[PDB]
């Protein structure tokens, strides 16, 4: 289905430009606004599935291990 191109080092850099505050981590109310940005209107009960998917640890927050994994399989 096509390639996506671009690679693992780019999102490395977005990570930081997610965590817009003193937190190292992309947790649930982060995503809000990130998704509600968009136009996909995404309510809580579809954020946090984003979130499930990801939360290899159950730390409440995406890390760059957990991320990247969603983002390489977006929705
Ligand atoms: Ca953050
Ligand atoms: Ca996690």
Redo the contacts with the bound molecule.
Sequence with gaps: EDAKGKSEEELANCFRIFDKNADG?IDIEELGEILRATGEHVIEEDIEDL?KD??????????F??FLKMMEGVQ
């Design positions: 981590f979130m990801s939360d290899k640890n159950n730390d409440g927050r995406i890390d291990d957990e």
